[PDB]
Each structure stands twice: as structure tokens, then as C-alpha cells.
Amino acid sequence: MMKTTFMANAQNVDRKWYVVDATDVPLGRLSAVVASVLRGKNKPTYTPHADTGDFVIVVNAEKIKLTGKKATDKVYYSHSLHPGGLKSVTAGELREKNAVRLIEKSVKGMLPHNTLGRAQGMKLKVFVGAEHTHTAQKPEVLDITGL
Amino acid sequence: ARVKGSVATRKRRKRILKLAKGYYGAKHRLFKTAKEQVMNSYYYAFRDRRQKKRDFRKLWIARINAAARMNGLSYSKLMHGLKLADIEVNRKMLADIAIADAAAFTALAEEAKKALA
Amino acid sequence: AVPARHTSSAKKNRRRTHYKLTAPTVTFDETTGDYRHSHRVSLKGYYKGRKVR
Amino acid sequence: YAIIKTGGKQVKVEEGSVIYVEKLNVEAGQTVTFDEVIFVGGETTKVGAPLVEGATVVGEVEKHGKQKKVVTFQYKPKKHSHRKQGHRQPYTKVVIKSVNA
Amino acid sequence: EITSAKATAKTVRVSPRKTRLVIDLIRGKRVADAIAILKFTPTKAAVEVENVLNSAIANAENNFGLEKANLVVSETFINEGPTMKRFRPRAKGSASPINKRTAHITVVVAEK
RNA sequence: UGAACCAGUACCGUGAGGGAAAGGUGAAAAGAACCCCGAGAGGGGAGUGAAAUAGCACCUGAAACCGUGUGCCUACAAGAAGUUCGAGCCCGUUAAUGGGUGAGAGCGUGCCUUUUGUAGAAUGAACCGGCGAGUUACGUUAUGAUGCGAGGUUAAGUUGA
RNA sequence: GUUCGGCAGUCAGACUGCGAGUGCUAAGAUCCGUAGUCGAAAGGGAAACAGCCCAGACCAACAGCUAAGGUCCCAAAAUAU
RNA sequence: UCAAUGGUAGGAGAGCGUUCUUAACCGCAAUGAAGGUAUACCGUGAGGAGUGCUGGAGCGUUAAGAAGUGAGAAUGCCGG
């Protein structure tokens, strides 16, 4: 009666690799489903300690389909612990410079904020204008839609 | 009649401490923080006698919408097809078919396809 | 000045970690002993191989 | 291989799988059969099974006993919360050979 | 036949916490290293551990004579005993006592 | 009994006064000859005794404290220090749906008095053990129990253990 | 429900509306009547929340269904029509 | 079978455990009482025994009576 559950993963994990891209795709609608795959939530094998952390690959990450004037009023912030620690990276700015944390900080907002969330969330694969590198392994392109 | 029952009193002390053993550090080297420490633990073990119910069911429905979503199927219209479906409204054994069941899983999914149909 | 709460003895020993003593380098059995330290005098008057009481 | 809900617990049985189940009016070991078995289940065979007939769990009844006396003190207000219950359960270990599938 | 090379001591005021500063150097090494550091120890606590140490080699030849050059320390421990207090005066009726630090001093050596 | 013990002792205070602490070796000291370490004590052998973890404050020996060894885990972690599940490891039991772990992950504001409401920056608690608080004397009322019943009832006292 | 008999404690509460009063028709302000709530009632919802809403817990359970409220991720259900 | 089982101050009922009880009932005890210790049993609870070990003299039953009688917590106390 007692052990009708099953992990089937918590030692025997999988490892798969996915080139996931669209050049312009909107940020939220990409973000929560690449969050779903970096969980492996879409994989039918969930465990709260699954470690189905997908090799979530992005290249050519120049553009969000940017609704409204969000490149003028998105503006980010930060706070260094020195008092009066406002330091702001702003809206359209550093998109053209380095659109990396332009994504994965928002996917930190996606993820379950814990050691596993920072595990695969700090195991993203991020490229902004590239053909990336190390196709020694086998990468696979995932979808287009927000499903 | 100035009597004590001293060893009996310490046997209540001994009884609750031996039943209290295991937690962090100083606690069994003391008395009273350990007293809640079993006690709080089966307060919400009493809640988890309802909440591993209500979270293993989240594992159930979550993994079954994971495989349904692997067939591109959403849980609400799937279950809606399960009430549309047969004498089966069987739930969580139908969650347990996450192992290796294209026959049971995708075919019962097709039963739901002819239930929405 | 005056402490607030009890030191937990594990943390008390975590204070007591770096407090340890350091072994001095002892010259071992010379003839069959006895001993000095390098840059120091034997019990037989010897530093630099000559007896000085 | 089959699925049977004896109590309010629907159960994958394998044709040989020892399981556990709450107390039934079996007495010591009389290996009796139960009949509301709904699935072919764990199949690798004939499919479907909305309501199954003749594939009943010919149950190889073994034993029933006491589970584990887990305990109860409850609810914590301040000002003298109060007191214990706590029991075990007359569980029922029964091996299941011989489904008709 | 047994190694059993143990001696002990009692009723000496030596701060066993600082003897637990002493024994970490001891517990692994050969007795030549032990009397090496022990003769060259700039603490007061570790001279008289040749009473136990010499008395324990003197156990090993008291009724063994075994592996006398070969003897590396098996184990030690030095514990507090009953620390004898004394009602020390301190200003305006303060006068707190003093725990004179008793110690058992226990050494086993063996081979290998 | 303050006081089982050289107790009204020690001790405080000039005084009037106050006022402590503490019993147990072993049957029998048969109290550890000797030998060795050690300045000595103390130890260690020997032997003693039914027993030496039994060695002079010595039956029995927790408890806080300090340890020494031990299987597991932890040096990308910000918890009333928990559950529940559980990777993985180790071990095998008031023989048992075994235990010791526990990474990881979900959800989780200590306990007491008072208050309208305290998680508390409201108190209070260093810890551990011991002590430590709703009685009885007589009376009334209520409720039952029993006995006999318009009749129940002996008080004080006397006898007697 | 009454009656009779013991045995109690409670006197000082808030809060949410709703209708009053006083107050700058200020207030988590007072002071009424009125219902609920807490107190003395968990769980869920609203980010934590004593008072609002829902829903009153003997217990097991690896059952389902549902209240409000939700269904892009944390965080489960609709990238639903 | 049906219905009930949040619950503080409140009130009612019931039971556990300690000690002494000459009572008896009736045993244990050196092959080991009590007491301690580990213990992966049982009992709705309080609680109960089993085993391993210390330990070397009183203890347990049952049932009933009687109680300085059920211990955290107070600048509780004393001792460590």
C-alpha cells in the first residue's frame, strides 16, 4: 500500500540538450516555458529533487518582441551594499550591449528560488548573437509557440 | 507520608527524552526545547497526513499533465474528457502510468479523444 | 560587554579551533640522542658541534 | 498485472505482487478473490478496460495485523493545549498472484 | 600477552583544557617524537607527562619489555577531576572562588 | 531536633542575637608485603579479598560539564533548527512493512503569566537534580450510599487491649 | 421549555459591516443598538493577517468531489473559448 | 444502522501512577530483589512489562483502605 509513489529519476537522471531560439520572441512567453524545460517540468518524470535540469541553449538573443515603449520604461535597478547603493541598468540599454541578464535575471524570477533553481538557473546556456560553440554534443531545437 | 516517587518522576523524564531523541545538538543535552521538538513535528506531520496527500497529488496531476503535455494535452480538457469518458474516472493510478505506458497512457488518452469526440 | 545568550559549545570550540599549539622542530637522535633544536644548543653543550655549558 | 480498488484505494497489482490493504472479513489466510477489478492494467496485451469482467484478483490472502502506533497531541493554542489520541492500523498484507490477464 | 601500556595520574593542578592544547601533538607520533617535544615543550603542563609517559614505558617493561624502541602512542586522554575551589576575595564582598584544575592523565602506547 | 556527624559547632556581628555543611568501604582491614616508574605524591605490576570500577570523603551510581574513539553528512550556505518525502551511504533489530543516517526538496513565528490582541523589542526562566504549595479540627448545607423507619438516636462518661 | 437543587465564573472586550451619537460627519478614536467574527475555532483565500471572505478539525488513509478564490513561472489547474 | 466527537476560564463523569498499608491472596529473590543502563515491544493516554548489562538486598504482586500523593516554569530554594 505504502510506496505506490515513484521517483524513477532521483539517481538515474537524464541529460539532454536543446538549442532553443527565436530572434525576436517575447520575453515572458519564452521565459516561463524555457523555465518549464529547465525544470524538466514538461518531462514526465518530476520529483521535487529531480535534477532534470535541461541544457537550455539560446543563441541570437538580440530581440524581444517589445510591446509598448519597454525599451524606454522597463528600467532595471540594483543596490550595492554601500549606502545609497542605487545602480541602475536601464530599459533599452545593455540590450544591445549584453542581452544576457536581460534574460536570465527574469528567469531567476521564473524559477523556484532555491539551490536547485539556482542550480539549473545557474546552468543556463546563453548566447546573444552567436552560432554558439561546442556542438560536440548533440543539441536539438525546441518549439516556436508559447504553447 | 513524606514520600517522593522520584524514580517514577524521572521515568516520565526518561520516557519523554528517550522518545525525544534525534534532533539538533544541544536539545537532548537539555530538556524542554526537545519537548516541542517532537511535538511541533507531529503537529505538521498531522498536517502532512493531509498535505503529502495534497502534494503527492500535485506530483500525480503534474506529471500526468507533463506526459499529457508531451502529447500536447492539457489536464483540464483531459480530465474533462475523463468525466466525458467511461466507467473509469480513475485518477492517480492513471497518474502512476508515467512509467513506460504509451499503450495505457496514450490509448486511454485516445479514449478521452473519443470522449471529447 | 556582557554577553547576551549562551554560547553553544560547538561554536565555542569553533572559537577554539585556531587556538592550538605549534610543534617545535626537534633534532632527533644525534648519536643516539640527546636532542637540540636547530639554531639551538644540545643538552651536552653542543651548538655548532662544540660543548658550551 | 491489473488494477483493483478494494477499499477507497485503487491499486496496481502485478500477478504476484505482494500488497497491503486494510482489514477485510478474511480471518487467517483463506485466499479469496475480489471482483471490482477495473483494468487489464500493466497490460502489454489487450487494451481499453472501462469495466472489466472475469479478470478478477484471485487474492492469495496472507495476514492482517497492527500497523504502527503513531500518536496525537493536538492544535496548540497558548494557555494549556490538550491531549492525546494515537493509534495504529489493522493493516493486511496479502500477496496477489493470479489475475486473469 | 597484551600491549596495555597505560599509566595515569591524579591530583595535579594543570589546566586540562591546556593539556588538550598539549595532546594533539602527542596522539599520533612515536615516543621519540613524544619525549622530543615533551622535553622541548615551553608549557608547564607537559614536563610531568613523563611521569605517566615514563611510568607507562615502565609499565611496558614493568611486566612486558615489549617493543620498547618501537612503542608509538596508542591513545591518551587527560581529564578534569574534582577541581578544588577556593573562596577568592574580590572587592566589596565580591569574592568568587577558584577551580583548581584536577586531572587524570592517561596514556596507552603500543606497536604499529 | 538548628543539630543522626564532638551543634548551638564552625562562622557572622562589639553586643543583644543569628546560624551553617557533612552518615554508609569491605563480612572481617583481612588497608594493597614486595617489585618498578616517579623529587615526592600518585601510578603500575604483584598479591589482598566473593569481588580493587572495592583502595580509605570507600555501597549504588544518573544529571548538567568535559572527553576519547566510532558509521554517515557538511567548507555556494543566510533554518524556532522542524516535519514529510527522499537520492545516496552505513549497519543488521523487545524479528520487526528494520535501524542509523541524511544531501536535496515542500511547508512550517519556542514555552509560560497577563491581555482585546503578544511570535515578540511584555514578563520570566543559565542548566541539571532534590525539595517545594488546596489540608485537616469543629459546624452547616447539598448530593448520594447504607441502616432502620413516625421511630430514629446515645452524647459525655463507664467497662475494656 | 418550565420548576427545584447544587456548582460556577463572567463585569474591561475588541474588530468587521449596518443604523445612531460625539469629534475636523479626523481616526486602527470614543459611546450606543444591531448581526457576525475572534477571543475561545484550525484549513484555504487575499505576500505574511485574531477580527474580512469561505469553510467548523475524533483518527487513519498514496481516495474522489468541491467552497470562496484561482489556472504565463515560482506555485497546481485555461499561453481556454 | 443512524446521529455526534474545535474547545479556554467553567461544570460533570471515569481511569492511571507513587508510598504506606500486620491484614490476606502469594509469590520472588544470589541461578541475583530493589535501583541504574541500552532496548528496533505493547497500551487511546497516563502507563506496562521482555531482554542485555551494573548491582548485591529487599521487592513485587492482586484487591481494598489510608495519604505530607502525582513537577518546569515563582528573581522559587539548596547542591553541582
Tab-separated table of N, CA, C and O (backbone and C1' of nucleotides) in Angstrom, chain F residues 66-113:
chain	number	residue	atom	x	y	z
F	66	C	P	30.963	20.905	27.579
F	66	C	O5'	32.378	20.182	27.661
F	66	C	C5'	33.490	20.861	28.215
F	66	C	C4'	34.502	19.897	28.763
F	66	C	C3'	35.039	18.897	27.769
F	66	C	O3'	36.081	19.429	26.986
F	66	C	C1'	34.452	17.789	29.765
F	67	G	P	35.942	19.436	25.394
F	67	G	O5'	36.653	18.086	24.936
F	67	G	C5'	35.932	16.866	24.890
F	67	G	C4'	36.647	15.780	25.645
F	67	G	C3'	37.056	14.582	24.816
F	67	G	O3'	38.265	14.801	24.126
F	67	G	C1'	36.006	13.845	26.791
F	68	U	P	38.291	14.699	22.532
F	68	U	O5'	39.166	13.404	22.267
F	68	U	C5'	40.014	12.907	23.284
F	68	U	C4'	39.923	11.413	23.357
F	68	U	C3'	39.661	10.750	22.025
F	68	U	O3'	40.850	10.570	21.294
F	68	U	C1'	38.205	9.862	23.662
F	69	G	P	40.789	10.544	19.699
F	69	G	O5'	40.399	9.037	19.370
F	69	G	C5'	39.499	8.726	18.322
F	69	G	C4'	38.900	7.361	18.516
F	69	G	C3'	37.763	7.003	17.581
F	69	G	O3'	38.191	6.587	16.305
F	69	G	C1'	37.102	6.531	19.762
F	70	U	P	37.775	7.466	15.033
F	70	U	O5'	36.470	6.749	14.478
F	70	U	C5'	36.432	5.341	14.325
F	70	U	C4'	35.115	4.783	14.790
F	70	U	C3'	33.889	5.195	13.987
F	70	U	O3'	33.685	4.408	12.821
F	70	U	C1'	33.459	5.487	16.294
F	71	G	P	34.331	4.843	11.412
F	71	G	O5'	33.118	4.817	10.374
F	71	G	C5'	32.665	3.608	9.778
F	71	G	C4'	31.208	3.703	9.395
F	71	G	C3'	30.803	4.993	8.692
F	71	G	O3'	31.003	4.932	7.290
F	71	G	C1'	29.361	4.622	10.516
F	72	C	P	31.447	6.243	6.479
F	72	C	O5'	30.108	7.090	6.357
F	72	C	C5'	28.952	6.548	5.743
F	72	C	C4'	27.785	7.472	5.932
F	72	C	C3'	28.045	8.898	5.496
F	72	C	O3'	27.847	9.083	4.112
F	72	C	C1'	27.087	8.902	7.650
F	73	C	P	28.794	10.097	3.318
F	73	C	O5'	28.208	11.523	3.690
F	73	C	C5'	26.865	11.849	3.394
F	73	C	C4'	26.468	13.101	4.115
F	73	C	C3'	27.348	14.296	3.832
F	73	C	O3'	26.962	14.956	2.648
F	73	C	C1'	26.961	14.109	6.161
F	74	U	P	28.054	15.737	1.782
F	74	U	O5'	28.294	17.083	2.592
F	74	U	C5'	27.263	18.045	2.681
F	74	U	C4'	27.536	19.045	3.767
F	74	U	C3'	28.762	19.914	3.580
F	74	U	O3'	28.519	20.996	2.700
F	74	U	C1'	28.655	19.129	5.817
F	75	A	P	29.560	21.343	1.532
F	75	A	O5'	30.723	22.116	2.288
F	75	A	C5'	30.413	23.223	3.114
F	75	A	C4'	31.535	24.220	3.149
F	75	A	C3'	32.379	24.308	1.900
F	75	A	O3'	31.749	25.036	0.869
F	75	A	C1'	33.775	24.309	3.799
F	76	C	P	31.562	24.351	-0.564
F	76	C	O5'	30.088	24.745	-0.999
F	76	C	C5'	29.888	25.735	-1.997
F	76	C	C4'	28.757	26.658	-1.640
F	76	C	C3'	27.384	26.240	-2.177
F	76	C	O3'	26.369	26.482	-1.202
F	76	C	C1'	27.892	28.429	-2.878
F	77	A	P	24.984	25.668	-1.298
F	77	A	O5'	24.541	25.415	0.201
F	77	A	C5'	23.416	26.085	0.739
F	77	A	C4'	23.764	26.667	2.076
F	77	A	C3'	23.093	27.976	2.438
F	77	A	O3'	21.776	27.822	2.924
F	77	A	C1'	25.402	28.139	2.853
F	78	A	P	20.608	28.742	2.322
F	78	A	O5'	20.592	29.998	3.288
F	78	A	C5'	20.809	29.828	4.674
F	78	A	C4'	20.860	31.154	5.365
F	78	A	C3'	19.646	32.040	5.184
F	78	A	O3'	18.620	31.698	6.083
F	78	A	C1'	21.655	33.307	5.035
F	79	G	P	17.287	30.996	5.558
F	79	G	O5'	16.927	30.013	6.747
F	79	G	C5'	15.946	30.353	7.720
F	79	G	C4'	15.307	29.097	8.237
F	79	G	C3'	14.858	29.118	9.687
F	79	G	O3'	13.786	28.199	9.812
F	79	G	C1'	16.544	27.496	9.414
F	80	A	P	12.513	28.577	10.695
F	80	A	O5'	12.603	27.589	11.938
F	80	A	C5'	11.762	27.777	13.067
F	80	A	C4'	12.291	27.070	14.284
F	80	A	C3'	11.216	26.478	15.183
F	80	A	O3'	11.770	25.379	15.888
F	80	A	C1'	12.415	28.065	16.388
F	81	A	P	11.531	23.885	15.381
F	81	A	O5'	12.950	23.206	15.608
F	81	A	C5'	14.141	23.974	15.536
F	81	A	C4'	15.083	23.399	14.514
F	81	A	C3'	16.308	22.684	15.066
F	81	A	O3'	16.580	21.531	14.281
F	81	A	C1'	16.975	24.483	13.668
F	82	G	P	16.386	20.091	14.951
F	82	G	O5'	14.865	19.742	14.691
F	82	G	C5'	14.389	19.430	13.396
F	82	G	C4'	12.903	19.609	13.378
F	82	G	C3'	12.097	18.829	12.357
F	82	G	O3'	11.842	17.479	12.700
F	82	G	C1'	11.452	21.053	12.262
F	83	U	P	12.421	16.308	11.764
F	83	U	O5'	11.145	15.643	11.095
F	83	U	C5'	10.040	15.235	11.874
F	83	U	C4'	8.794	15.841	11.314
F	83	U	C3'	8.288	15.233	10.029
F	83	U	O3'	7.494	14.092	10.262
F	83	U	C1'	8.333	17.577	9.823
F	84	U	P	8.010	12.662	9.772
F	84	U	O5'	7.241	12.434	8.406
F	84	U	C5'	6.006	13.077	8.158
F	84	U	C4'	5.928	13.494	6.724
F	84	U	C3'	6.749	12.650	5.782
F	84	U	O3'	6.138	11.424	5.461
F	84	U	C1'	7.051	14.931	5.264
F	85	C	P	7.064	10.136	5.277
F	85	C	O5'	7.763	10.378	3.869
F	85	C	C5'	6.985	10.332	2.692
F	85	C	C4'	7.666	10.993	1.528
F	85	C	C3'	8.986	10.408	1.086
F	85	C	O3'	8.879	9.194	0.376
F	85	C	C1'	9.149	12.742	1.088
F	86	G	P	9.901	8.004	0.708
F	86	G	O5'	11.282	8.428	0.033
F	86	G	C5'	11.384	8.771	-1.339
F	86	G	C4'	12.583	9.655	-1.573
F	86	G	C3'	13.903	9.097	-1.077
F	86	G	O3'	14.503	8.253	-2.040
F	86	G	C1'	13.626	11.277	-0.236
F	87	A	P	15.641	7.199	-1.632
F	87	A	O5'	16.812	7.524	-2.656
F	87	A	C5'	16.527	7.787	-4.020
F	87	A	C4'	17.622	8.606	-4.644
F	87	A	C3'	19.027	8.143	-4.325
F	87	A	O3'	19.463	7.062	-5.118
F	87	A	C1'	18.889	10.423	-3.876
F	88	G	P	19.609	5.611	-4.450
F	88	G	O5'	21.143	5.513	-4.049
F	88	G	C5'	22.120	6.308	-4.694
F	88	G	C4'	23.038	6.939	-3.686
F	88	G	C3'	23.401	6.070	-2.503
F	88	G	O3'	24.346	5.061	-2.792
F	88	G	C1'	22.838	8.193	-1.719
F	89	C	P	24.156	3.613	-2.130
F	89	C	O5'	25.342	3.514	-1.077
F	89	C	C5'	26.404	4.451	-1.096
F	89	C	C4'	26.756	4.884	0.299
F	89	C	C3'	26.738	3.783	1.333
F	89	C	O3'	27.892	2.969	1.289
F	89	C	C1'	25.656	5.696	2.200
F	90	C	P	27.754	1.398	1.565
F	90	C	O5'	27.736	1.300	3.151
F	90	C	C5'	28.748	1.923	3.922
F	90	C	C4'	28.324	2.030	5.356
F	90	C	C3'	27.801	0.744	5.953
F	90	C	O3'	28.826	-0.143	6.343
F	90	C	C1'	26.358	2.513	6.522
F	91	C	P	28.577	-1.721	6.232
F	91	C	O5'	27.623	-2.044	7.466
F	91	C	C5'	28.084	-1.865	8.793
F	91	C	C4'	26.946	-1.868	9.775
F	91	C	C3'	26.127	-3.140	9.839
F	91	C	O3'	26.736	-4.168	10.593
F	91	C	C1'	24.684	-1.276	9.812
F	92	G	P	26.353	-5.698	10.300
F	92	G	O5'	24.896	-5.885	10.921
F	92	G	C5'	24.663	-5.843	12.328
F	92	G	C4'	23.201	-5.619	12.643
F	92	G	C3'	22.345	-6.880	12.700
F	92	G	O3'	21.229	-6.634	13.552
F	92	G	C1'	21.572	-5.512	10.962
F	93	U	P	21.183	-7.263	15.022
F	93	U	O5'	19.881	-6.626	15.677
F	93	U	C5'	19.950	-5.491	16.536
F	93	U	C4'	18.597	-4.839	16.733
F	93	U	C3'	17.586	-5.636	17.547
F	93	U	O3'	16.709	-4.739	18.218
F	93	U	C1'	16.789	-5.367	15.333
F	94	U	P	16.568	-4.813	19.814
F	94	U	O5'	15.246	-5.667	20.059
F	94	U	C5'	14.618	-5.655	21.336
F	94	U	C4'	13.544	-6.703	21.464
F	94	U	C3'	12.456	-6.646	20.409
F	94	U	O3'	11.970	-7.962	20.184
F	94	U	C1'	11.525	-6.153	22.544
F	95	A	P	12.626	-8.842	19.020
F	95	A	O5'	11.477	-8.924	17.932
F	95	A	C5'	11.180	-10.150	17.290
F	95	A	C4'	10.705	-9.912	15.886
F	95	A	C3'	10.367	-11.172	15.104
F	95	A	O3'	9.350	-10.864	14.160
F	95	A	C1'	12.104	-10.024	14.017
F	96	A	P	7.799	-10.983	14.544
F	96	A	O5'	7.177	-9.694	13.857
F	96	A	C5'	7.877	-9.040	12.812
F	96	A	C4'	8.365	-7.688	13.252
F	96	A	C3'	8.266	-6.579	12.225
F	96	A	O3'	6.960	-6.051	12.117
F	96	A	C1'	10.376	-6.496	13.271
F	97	U	P	6.016	-6.520	10.910
F	97	U	O5'	5.608	-5.160	10.190
F	97	U	C5'	5.089	-5.152	8.865
F	97	U	C4'	6.202	-5.000	7.866
F	97	U	C3'	7.208	-3.909	8.202
F	97	U	O3'	8.521	-4.367	7.914
F	97	U	C1'	6.259	-3.500	6.069
F	98	G	P	9.553	-4.502	9.131
F	98	G	O5'	10.841	-3.717	8.637
F	98	G	C5'	11.103	-2.413	9.120
F	98	G	C4'	12.104	-2.456	10.237
F	98	G	C3'	12.903	-1.179	10.447
F	98	G	O3'	12.239	-0.242	11.273
F	98	G	C1'	14.379	-2.992	10.278
F	99	G	P	12.491	1.329	11.065
F	99	G	O5'	13.927	1.585	11.695
F	99	G	C5'	14.151	1.408	13.081
F	99	G	C4'	15.620	1.377	13.382
F	99	G	C3'	16.384	2.643	13.045
F	99	G	O3'	16.282	3.623	14.058
F	99	G	C1'	17.551	0.771	12.218
F	100	G	P	16.369	5.177	13.682
F	100	G	O5'	17.916	5.423	13.406
F	100	G	C5'	18.878	5.251	14.434
F	100	G	C4'	20.275	5.362	13.888
F	100	G	C3'	20.545	6.593	13.053
F	100	G	O3'	20.753	7.758	13.824
F	100	G	C1'	21.392	4.718	11.935
F	101	U	P	19.651	8.922	13.786
F	101	U	O5'	20.224	9.974	12.738
F	101	U	C5'	20.025	9.789	11.348
F	101	U	C4'	21.327	9.538	10.644
F	101	U	C3'	21.709	10.600	9.643
F	101	U	O3'	22.374	11.691	10.239
F	101	U	C1'	21.941	8.453	8.667
F	102	G	P	21.592	13.075	10.399
F	102	G	O5'	22.306	14.034	9.362
F	102	G	C5'	21.543	14.695	8.375
F	102	G	C4'	21.686	14.022	7.039
F	102	G	C3'	20.701	14.460	5.982
F	102	G	O3'	21.099	15.667	5.376
F	102	G	C1'	20.901	12.098	5.967
F	103	A	P	20.004	16.705	4.854
F	103	A	O5'	20.750	17.410	3.651
F	103	A	C5'	22.164	17.438	3.641
F	103	A	C4'	22.680	17.131	2.269
F	103	A	C3'	21.921	17.816	1.153
F	103	A	O3'	22.336	19.148	0.936
F	103	A	C1'	22.136	15.529	0.650
F	104	G	P	21.318	20.352	1.216
F	104	G	O5'	20.207	20.181	0.095
F	104	G	C5'	20.543	20.232	-1.281
F	104	G	C4'	19.493	19.529	-2.089
F	104	G	C3'	18.071	19.988	-1.826
F	104	G	O3'	17.715	21.170	-2.513
F	104	G	C1'	18.147	17.646	-1.738
F	105	A	P	16.933	22.325	-1.728
F	105	A	O5'	15.614	22.572	-2.577
F	105	A	C5'	15.235	21.681	-3.607
F	105	A	C4'	13.931	21.003	-3.294
F	105	A	C3'	13.003	21.740	-2.348
F	105	A	O3'	12.252	22.750	-2.997
F	105	A	C1'	13.088	19.437	-1.782
F	106	G	P	11.541	23.902	-2.134
F	106	G	O5'	10.187	23.245	-1.619
F	106	G	C5'	8.926	23.612	-2.160
F	106	G	C4'	7.822	22.859	-1.465
F	106	G	C3'	7.322	23.474	-0.166
F	106	G	O3'	6.297	24.433	-0.362
F	106	G	C1'	7.841	21.206	0.192
F	107	C	P	6.537	25.974	0.022
F	107	C	O5'	5.744	26.172	1.391
F	107	C	C5'	4.395	25.755	1.535
F	107	C	C4'	4.220	24.979	2.811
F	107	C	C3'	4.636	25.712	4.071
F	107	C	O3'	3.619	26.539	4.586
F	107	C	C1'	5.618	23.563	4.049
F	108	G	P	4.009	27.975	5.168
F	108	G	O5'	4.823	27.648	6.495
F	108	G	C5'	4.249	27.891	7.768
F	108	G	C4'	4.603	26.796	8.735
F	108	G	C3'	5.549	27.190	9.861
F	108	G	O3'	4.869	27.712	10.995
F	108	G	C1'	6.367	25.256	8.789
F	109	U	P	4.618	29.290	11.173
F	109	U	O5'	5.235	29.645	12.597
F	109	U	C5'	6.640	29.777	12.759
F	109	U	C4'	7.006	30.528	14.012
F	109	U	C3'	5.900	30.670	15.054
F	109	U	O3'	6.468	30.550	16.353
F	109	U	C1'	6.738	32.790	14.495
F	110	G	P	5.569	30.024	17.576
F	110	G	O5'	6.442	28.871	18.231
F	110	G	C5'	7.828	29.062	18.447
F	110	G	C4'	8.318	28.205	19.578
F	110	G	C3'	7.502	28.284	20.847
F	110	G	O3'	6.405	27.401	20.797
F	110	G	C1'	9.814	28.452	21.351
F	111	C	P	5.003	27.855	21.407
F	111	C	O5'	5.212	27.661	22.973
F	111	C	C5'	5.561	26.391	23.499
F	111	C	C4'	5.992	26.488	24.937
F	111	C	C3'	5.086	27.290	25.849
F	111	C	O3'	3.950	26.575	26.287
F	111	C	C1'	7.340	27.850	26.270
F	112	C	P	2.801	27.344	27.102
F	112	C	O5'	3.214	27.191	28.627
F	112	C	C5'	2.452	27.847	29.622
F	112	C	C4'	3.314	28.707	30.506
F	112	C	C3'	2.653	29.932	31.110
F	112	C	O3'	1.887	29.615	32.251
F	112	C	C1'	4.834	30.465	30.343
F	113	U	P	0.295	29.747	32.222
F	113	U	O5'	0.023	31.291	32.481
F	113	U	C5'	-0.591	31.721	33.683
F	113	U	C4'	-0.004	33.021	34.152
F	113	U	C3'	-0.767	34.269	33.751
F	113	U	O3'	-1.864	34.541	34.602
F	113	U	C1'	1.522	34.559	33.266
